[PDB]
């Protein structure tokens, strides 16, 4: 039902503003925090009611936004020292124009299946572009915007800033926040180097070097798990009992999903289980990293217990473990990581990032990707905010994605990929 009519490069439009053309020899070295994150494309879908701005208005807005986000018009290569870098060669972001011969309402709400892959450019066929955008016009004028973005360039927060910046530029509003691009200025190692934690087996592992051998495998099904305002309130009340300050929605929902997933998998009580939680270093580091910084600023809390202890103790005990572990990922932790990554140990011991996108084998661990601060209300091309958003189809068992309610009603939706055989146990443990 979806027809692609155009696919072309969109470059920074310096002339829109009489600005000097960017120097296309400009190179930005990736930071040790960029190189700690996933080398992979992430896809997300936004939906807008009719009427929405035409493709030419959206395209002109993209050209203007890319002046202040040249990273997304660039290509991955190497700098003078041979370190991985973004070449700001302005080769362009991909801009794909599509039409659907159905009303958007007829297929709403969209479900997390392979069908939604048709609403964004592929991240799986080795594109050269770091930013790929699809605008799909449905039969009654509704607009779907699909993004496919390189995680090595930006984390969820700086990727979101770009989504918003495109919408601001389209409306003729000043880009806010003001982007910060000079990655080489950030995360300098201390003199002397000072490693305070063991990063081997955490952020780093030793370098390790068929179709149709997966026939007896259970299918992974992406389930939407709805946490009502009321359910969150009870969960947080439970977790926060006797504390001088209530536990966060994020930490409570993570604890609940971790415990629910562990029961659903029916693990041996003695099995080790960990949840990986992304921690935003921007406010935690000293000095603080600016809101407009275009790079990755993530490390992970990895709270760990046994399946038996997790499922037999109340969820309160799980939230307490998550809270304590997240609090340890502080300025000193980030600076220890930076110093370790700059020490030469990584090169000498042939270590690579544990953030390894090329593996769907998470059990008995889980990973939670929080999109709770994904742009929504701020996403306005001049036709109003979106009415719907969702992650693309990523059937990786135990990789959970948390979204805020696209109704703004203060509930939370988790996209939970489960083995089909585990779904009924998950459903019964859930409340």
Curated annotation (Swiss-Prot):
One GO molecular function term?
agmatine N4-coumaroyltransferase activity
Key word Acyltransferase present in the record? yes
- Taxonomically, the superkingdom here is Eukaryota
pH-linked activity = Optimum pH is 7.5. Half maximum activity is seen at pH 6.9 and 8.1.
Q: How does activity depend on temperature?
A: Optimum temperature is 40 degrees Celsius.
The annotated consequence of residue 207 to Y reads: In strain: cv. Triumph
User: What are the catalytic residues?
Assistant: 151 (proton acceptor), 380 (proton acceptor)
Keyword check for Transferase: yes
Ordered alphabetically, the record's keywords are: Acyltransferase, Transferase
* Activity control summary: Inhibited by DEPC. Completely inhibited by ZnSO(4), strongly inhibited by CuSO(4), partially inhibited by MnCl(2). Unaffected by MgCl(2) or CaCl(2).
- What's the reported outcome of changing residue 373 to L? In strain: cv. Triumph
User: What's its catalytic activity?
Assistant: 4-coumaroyl-CoA + agmatine = N-(4-guanidinobutyl)-4-hydroxycinnamamide + CoA + H(+)
Pfam families associated with the record: Transferase
The protein's matches in InterPro entries, at most eight in alphabetical order, are given as: CAT-like_dom_sf, Plant_Fungal_Acyltransferase
- EC number(s) reported in the record: 2.3.1.64
Subunit structure comment from the entry? Monomer.
Q: What is stated as this protein's family in its record?
A: Belongs to the plant acyltransferase family.
Functional description taken from the UniProt entry: Involved in the synthesis of hordatines (antifungal hydroxycinnamoylagmatine derivatives). Specific for agmatine as the acyl acceptor, inactive towards tyramine and putrescine. Has activity with the acyl donors 4-coumaroyl-CoA, cinnamoyl-CoA, caffeoyl-CoA, feruloyl-CoA, and to a lesser extent sinapoyl-CoA.
Q: What is this protein called?
A: Agmatine coumaroyltransferase-1
What is the primary gene name for this protein?
A: ACT-1
